Amino acid sequence: QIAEFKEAFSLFDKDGDGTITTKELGTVMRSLGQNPTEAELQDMINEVDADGNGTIDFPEFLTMMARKMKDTDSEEEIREAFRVFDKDGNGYISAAELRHVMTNLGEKLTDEEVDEMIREADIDGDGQVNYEEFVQMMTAK
Amino acid sequence: AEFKEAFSLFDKDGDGTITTKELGTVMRSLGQNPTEAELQDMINEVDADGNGTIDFPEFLTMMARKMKDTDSEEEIREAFRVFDKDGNGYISAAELRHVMTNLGEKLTDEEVDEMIREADIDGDGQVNYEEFVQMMTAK
Amino acid sequence: AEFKEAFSLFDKDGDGTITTKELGTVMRSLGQNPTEAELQDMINEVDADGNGTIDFPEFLTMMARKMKDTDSEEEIREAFRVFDKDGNGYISAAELRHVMTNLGEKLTDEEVDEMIREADIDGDGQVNYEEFVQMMTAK
Amino acid sequence: QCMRDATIALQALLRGYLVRNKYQMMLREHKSIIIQKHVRGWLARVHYH
Numbered sequence A: 001q002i003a004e005f006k007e008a009f010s011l012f013d014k015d016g017d018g019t020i021t022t023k024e025l026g027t028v029m030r031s032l033g034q035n036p037t038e039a040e041l042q043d044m045i046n047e048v049d050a051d052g053n054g055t056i057d058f059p060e061f062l063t064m065m066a067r068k069m070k071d072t073d074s075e076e077e078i079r080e081a082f083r084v085f086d087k088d089g090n091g092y093i094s095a096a097e098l099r100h101v102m103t104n105l106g107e108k109l110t111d112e113e114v115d116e117m118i119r120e121a122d123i124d125g126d127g128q129v130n131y132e133e134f135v136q137m138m139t140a141k
Numbered sequence B, C: 001a002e003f004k005e006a007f008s009l010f011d012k013d014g015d016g017t018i019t020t021k022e023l024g025t026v027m028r029s030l031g032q033n034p035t036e037a038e039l040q041d042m043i044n045e046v047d048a049d050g051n052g053t054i055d056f057p058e059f060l061t062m063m064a065r066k067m068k069d070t071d072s073e074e075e076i077r078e079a080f081r082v083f084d085k086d087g088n089g090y091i092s093a094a095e096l097r098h099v100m101t102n103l104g105e106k107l108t109d110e111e112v113d114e115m116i117r118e119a120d121i122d123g124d125g126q127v128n129y130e131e132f133v134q135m136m137t138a139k
Numbered sequence D: 001q002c003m004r005d006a007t008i009a010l011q012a013l014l015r016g017y018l019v020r021n022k023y024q025m026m027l028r029e030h031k032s033i034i035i036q037k038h039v040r041g042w043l044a045r046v047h048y049h
Helices: A002-012 A022-032 A038-045 A058-074 A095-104 A111-117 A131-139 B004-010 B020-030 B036-044 B056-065 B067-072 B093-101 B109-115 B129-137 C004-010 C020-030 C036-044 C056-065 C067-072 C093-102 C109-115 C129-137 D002-039 D043-047
Strands: A019-021 A055-057 A092-094 A128-130 B017-019 B053-055 B090-092 B126-128 C017-019 C053-055 C090-092 C126-128
Touching: A002 A022, A002 A058, A002 D002, A019 A022, A022 A038, A022 A055, A022 A058, A022 D002, A038 A058, A055 A058, A092 A095, A095 A111, A095 A128, A095 D002, A111 D002, A128 A131, A131 D002, B004 B020, B004 B056, B017 B020, B020 B036, B020 B053, B020 B056, B036 B056, B053 B056, B056 B067, B090 B093, B093 B109, B093 B126, B126 B129, C004 C020, C004 C056, C017 C020, C020 C036, C020 C053, C020 C056, C020 D043, C036 C056, C053 C056, C056 C067, C090 C093, C093 C109, C093 C126, C093 D002, C126 C129, C129 D002
Parallel strands: none
Antiparallel strands: A019 A055, A092 A128, B017 B053, B090 B126, C017 C053, C090 C126
């Protein structure tokens, strides 16, 4: 709870001012555990207080989390997902195909986000990924 | 209803073009509802005769030329028949399959067998077609 | 934590000044744990640019300016990892050498070798890190 | 739509995984720093012990 989260907050505070930049709201939520979309963050970064604010304190954030808790919790449910590239039902997809789905489809990720992700994803010597194991690792928490 | 992002989900390769035969599925992905006939007429009224693929500009010009007919297909919310005349509110699964697979722009039997999964059928052999039309669209 | 007596043991000449490169060691003889980075930042935020040595007054003014950061380095009495998540209470000697000699303000392999003298290692190859942190600090 | 929703969930989860890894790595470096530092407080051990 709040002790691990305070240590996460104290790592996001870099200046040591007690307050983190409002831009780093969606990384702090995600660091604690949650997954939120960057739309959901925009719909709860707005306020009359935090919309006007340049930085946010740990009491403010704890207040935001309490207000939006249900929606915020709803982001942690997803453990199962389905994806094609595999049509033949091998259970495997290439790293090229994974990069194409992540960077070319949906909200779109960057290549740097995908390159970051493939530092904590098993990839065999063929260059393929078991996508059932990959979904389990990403949801793992 | 043009959407570049929808085009970029049909383009998978990133060539900037999609096959001329994926035109009906792209219009229908967008929001529109054109017949397979209307889709062919839209292609045939352009000298896209020899064209194997379409770019987003070409697709934009076709939708703008045919906006009125294409918009008409997303007006409707209710659907009558003309199959029933008694006004029983019921149609036989045989007549329902016949209108779907024998009239108009025919569905396959496998498409129809999918839509009659979970659809109740009485001891006469008739289905409530109002519930069946609602269950197909309202999903 | 200023101490004139501690300064008089660094001053071995009775000049009144000590070398600017013995500033980190003087802080860590007083009490204070400052990082090698923190030590460089405190020197760099004074125009002690050309200064070859520091007097006790200069050292006093630096500690008073930086009291808040420097005090923080002597709060900590415990030390969790974040290199066990299973909660086995054990870490491999390989991971323990890697954090020490590859992460942060890197120790030398000879320094790490000194700290693993008389440190028990099982048949898996793992060390009780809680005992190892206590055995390093409580001395 | 269902394929697009499955892709957005995948990249939201990936973004939530990445930051946790990046935080975890930062904590590993920060943990090393504060132990390396406490050991080099043993200039004390040389000076009086």
